[PDB]
Write a protein that binds this DNA or RNA. Sequence first.
DNA 1: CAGTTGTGCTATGA
DNA 2: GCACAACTG
Lengths: 171, 97, 112, 268, 107, 84, 178, 557
Amino acid sequence: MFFIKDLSLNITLHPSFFGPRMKQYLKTKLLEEVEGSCTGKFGYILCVLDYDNIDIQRGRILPTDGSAEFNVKYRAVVFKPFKGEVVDGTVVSCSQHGFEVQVGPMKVFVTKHLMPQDLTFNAGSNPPSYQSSEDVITIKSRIRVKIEGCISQVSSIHAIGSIKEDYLGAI
Amino acid sequence: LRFGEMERDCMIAHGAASFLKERLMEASDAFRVHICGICGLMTVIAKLNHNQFECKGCDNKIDIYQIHIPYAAKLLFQELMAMNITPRLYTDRSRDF
Amino acid sequence: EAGRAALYKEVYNVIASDGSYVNYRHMALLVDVMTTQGGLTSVTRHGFNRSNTGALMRCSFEETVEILFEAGASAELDDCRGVSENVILGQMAPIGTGAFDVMIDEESLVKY
Amino acid sequence: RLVKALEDIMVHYDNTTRNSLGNVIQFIYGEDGMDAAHIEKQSLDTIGGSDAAFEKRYRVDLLNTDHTLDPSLLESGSEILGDLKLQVLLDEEYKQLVKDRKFLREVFVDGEANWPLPVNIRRIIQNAQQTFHIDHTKPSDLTIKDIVLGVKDLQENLLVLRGKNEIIQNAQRDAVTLFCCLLRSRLATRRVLQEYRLTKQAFDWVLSNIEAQFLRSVVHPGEMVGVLAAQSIGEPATQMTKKVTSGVPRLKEILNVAKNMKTPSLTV
Amino acid sequence: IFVYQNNITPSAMKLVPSIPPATIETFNEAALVVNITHHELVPKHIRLSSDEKRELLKRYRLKESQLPRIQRADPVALYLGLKRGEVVKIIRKSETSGRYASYRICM
Amino acid sequence: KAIPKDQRATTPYMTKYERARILGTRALQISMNAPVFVDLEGETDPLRIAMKELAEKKIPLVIRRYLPDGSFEDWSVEELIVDL
Amino acid sequence: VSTSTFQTRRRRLKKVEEEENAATLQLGQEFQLKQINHQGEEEELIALNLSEARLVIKEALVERRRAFKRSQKKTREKELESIDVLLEQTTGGNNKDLKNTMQYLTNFSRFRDQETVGAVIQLLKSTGLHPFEVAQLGSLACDTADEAKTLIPSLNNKISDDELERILKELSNLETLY
Amino acid sequence: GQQYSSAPLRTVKEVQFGLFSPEEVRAISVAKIRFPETMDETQTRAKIGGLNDPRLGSIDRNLKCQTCQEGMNECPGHFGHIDLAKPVFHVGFIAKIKKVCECVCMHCGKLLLDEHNELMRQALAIKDSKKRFAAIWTLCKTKMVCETDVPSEDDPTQLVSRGGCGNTQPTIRKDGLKLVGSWKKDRATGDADEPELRVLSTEEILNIFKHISVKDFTSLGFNEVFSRPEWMILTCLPVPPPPVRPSISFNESQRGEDDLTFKLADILKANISLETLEHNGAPHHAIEEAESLLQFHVATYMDNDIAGQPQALQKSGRPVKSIRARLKGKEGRIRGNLMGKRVDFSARTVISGDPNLELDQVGVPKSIAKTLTYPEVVTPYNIDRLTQLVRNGPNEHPGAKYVIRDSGDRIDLRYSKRAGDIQLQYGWKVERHIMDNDPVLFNRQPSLHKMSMMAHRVKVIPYSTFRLNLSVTSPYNADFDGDEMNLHVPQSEETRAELSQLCAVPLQIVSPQSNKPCMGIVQDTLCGIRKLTLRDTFIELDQVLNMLYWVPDWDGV
DNA sequence: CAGTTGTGCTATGA
DNA sequence: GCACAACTG
Ligand SMILES: [Mg+2]
Ligand SMILES: [Zn+2]
Ligand SMILES: [Zn+2]
Ligand SMILES: [Zn+2]
């Protein structure tokens, strides 16, 4: 998991910017668009690596308007979750239906039913928790989750997780 | 006024590629469509506002491009589809030469 | 080759008859085009319009619908190299002004 | 039909004439690579006349006292008589002009001299004269080497094709074959000195202009010769008004590659 | 090369491709009376070698498709016993250039 | 496939079509409030500025000359001969 | 316009099959083992353990902050506040994702020092496992070969029990303190 | 104009032609297209969710599209479908369908001839998709029996068993829209003498085509992804949205449906008869009767001008306009709407020759200059001029008609309450009047050569005629006996340049047609030039001075 | 192999 | 209003 990928974006510049701070503006636009971006193809496009060596290439003049299109070849850190992947995250939200574990830029949700029977919901607690004979899972809690599946929603990826199997759960 | 075939030829003869385009597009027909990248047809349901893209039947909500063709061409294409002919429009190549 | 030579002589003569002068090259180019294919090709739908050029281009002269029907059944692929295609497509054709591409170089842009 | 048959035909950046399939139609446009707008009917001098008057107009024998160039013609004249080394150059000059003559007579069998070619050499010379106020009385300051070799050099710079390889290089040689005959015909030693009465500068200037004028005369890649040629044949057909079928019906006959034609005939 | 007076039976004519790699040519005596290659209109055709052809296509960035053609059965193609794929160089005298080189590929 | 500089074999001179496209492009750009690499010595017409830019060879553009096979030779306006 | 890759495949009309993604190491087409870099060269996948990932991002932003100042010429809780500052100087701010990532990475990283991380990287990139498996052994803290082999299920027959357990023992020793 | 769309803007690089697989037709379909009734929710105006908008495109101009929201100028229209009650041939392919049957076994779907026949393997070699199919046909059409055992490539004594099926092959003849076979049979080696005669059903030919091997049909002209033979037979009919067949809506309470909308309602009608007919008590003859009719309506909708004469006519005698007809050249999509268009920023009037104009200029009547517009971007170099032109307005000559903001929204100076109090911002466009010295395309039809369309300098003049220099008469073929000429105004700085740099009158002077100049001194000037230049002709001081002054470049000497 | 029927076009703008 | 083109006899 957590990958480095060799991507490329196609930015179109308006003639007004055909000055010297051209490469500068293009590089910035790249970060504007691509950094913090989230696709399903590659997942979360987190940090654009090697700013100094971003390959601008030559920009082709688009015919009837005056603009120029560039293929900006780059390299960056991505995070694309997978089904069956084991993650170690921190509880954020927790309800009568289950808790939502924060794993990097993405949240994994554990269903009351994807946890062992021994773990029961406790409404009568500040903050709300899940209690067992031994373990107590509330907000700040750190958990080992098995990603059961992912849902590629727009500007994010969500997932459902299990803590029911072995070596999984509270850590 | 008609910028007919004969007048088209004259521009071709002049090598006035862009004047010719402007004459056929911007000064007439010019229209914008959304085509799918898988099936080369205008099947795309561009809800450009909610920024939703879709081409159901292709399940493609990703591989979509916008194109500027004369409305007459767009028509011709829909007319060919009505005749069971697929005028698959693609934005890249696979040939060389 | 002799057929080409004779074809020119015969073409030239129709123009020369009416006491007109046409530059060699033009007539040569026509004659050449009929000739190139291997034998004598007509300037009719049975002639040029039958070659392996882009379906869209060919449909623009005489067998329009028939040409387009064949295209589908034989899964023809138009190169989009022809003038006509670009004209149909509302694209800048690779003609004179469109025979090359133009690019900004950020190297020369910084030099000036 | 003419326009539709040729629409996609244009000159490419390799000086080739191709279509939408990139199939070669003419290897070099018009067989010469020249733009039709830059051509004028010029006289290929070398072609006609007696072998005697060709000799009178061209031959320079610095070894014969009656067939040398008079010191009246160039400063070098008096010191030029008997110079064996230079005679080798003039022998080449002559041998080439004779070669040229036989070649032209193979090309144009009828002996027609007037043909449309680039660069009006007559006009260049004319301007050189009014430009430099050429004194027809005073001798030239040109060397045989100046004239002989200067024309030899100019020839190498009449660039149509460019590639560095036998194939392309030979294509270039071929393309410029006729224009050179014209150039060699007009810029021969005797003509330059006795007729034109050119000075070193005036001559260098003539050569330099021929170069630019020629280079300027070549076709532009992108030139849409398809439509051009079609309109060039079509437009005069519009203007149209033994008894062998001619005019529009024969042209119809021709284009249609008609089998059962009106006036079949043999010229035995 | 078999020079035949009037005709060759279709029985015998089917035995022409029988012995490869060796090739057999049939020529009707009547055609050969006059050498067509000697005509005002008939230019020099030159058979290019495997190496020569390879160069022509290299130098012009060609596919064999792009080359102008000569049919196998073309009078001059027959005289030179040209095979499919073989290329010829044609030298014509130009009223434009003096000398012009065309190229034809066999069909 | 991109023919390297040392191998380029197209004219070293700028075509009529090239010039027309360069002048056209720069004028369109100049008019689109783009930066001008010349002293407008009272110039106001984007074409007249584009012309001045070409005359002083301060146009930052490259002509991508395509060959029938697909390959290309890139040439700078700076380097092209404008004898036209 | 969205982002594109090195991979070129021309899937003409042939929409689907779009294969399931599981650690049966059947990752994406995009996340194949055998891949291409911007320079056309073939190059094996790059997967990172949290800390390998932490130092990469940190370093990237550090050299970026240098370039942003160049052109302008004319302890975990203590590392958390430090990064939160670096982000404010190099990131678009609106990138709440990298902010959350950096926090997560700071808090869940097993090895603080580059030297330490390099040793881990060497120790693991010798087993000849898949970049993903190698990442998980560096990311997930395991004590049994069974702990490991259950959580990184792909491992199964690929490595020996005792071999894996030796590696775990070594990773436990390299485990940077707090 | 049209709204911003995120979607990456590209150009069509390739056009991959093919045929619709019903599966696709259904998949791309936003509706099906169940009832011939156009609209009127039973007499109640609004489209029926059943034909022409059961999601589809949209009528009303008001009221957005049901699937996408966009509306009229934006919504391209969305395809529907009708599931046909029985398979039908596509008119355009009837003969290919026949030629394909004539090349394959009409029982097992195996190519009649194969790798074993020397002439067949010779034809099978043909690289060209089309010629290869043609060569195959000429060979397989003769073959009348599906062979099971063929004489081996080494020896004809010990024959080899190739593909199965021994069935005899029919002799196919087209009885217009119907393909009828004539199997010779066998009967004591004699017969026929009296053959077996039956119509080949669409469905049987369909099953035969579905059994043709990928390799077998790929040897034929066909493609396994884009054009399988079975797709020449129509099972699922795509419904083209309203933009293809619009409803010309006069007033509020009145219809006006397209021809295609009627022919579709007929296909619809014919289909429901066939559907209920077969589902219920099938009187079998009435089944082949309603079928043949649907075959007719699907045929006529595509092509109407067929061999077997009955033209499908609308009750008015008027034959119903086929989609095929819509495309057929000089007028009709290709030739009429695409190789040529009627264009905006164009003008036409009577011409008259002026000796006071310059060769490259053109006299443009004020009213024309007042209509025609150049879209000019607000730049520091022009800002002030453009403001005065805006101030001047649409009625004064040097003026303007519209101010276009960055917002893309047009300010009509003609009416706008802020037409006076308006301040231009860099980047806006002022659509100004055509002014003196603008490059314009001027042309005289026919337009046989390049020179019949040339670029000229504007000169805004009074009176209603286009004025031109007499020496530019010949290139155009103009006479002032009542000729009219057309004018085109470029809208881009790029476009103007193309005209001024490539097609200007001074450039066109020496023509490549005959390597000579195509313009010279004419008429009065020619007649008079001889007259002035005789040796006998002398001029006294007084007139010499006017004659000099008149030459605009004269050195004052 | 030859005979008849079969097919698709017929200037540009007002 | 004609000029091949292709199927059938
Ligand atoms: Mg008139
Ligand atoms: Zn699709
Ligand atoms: Zn819609
Ligand atoms: Zn069978």
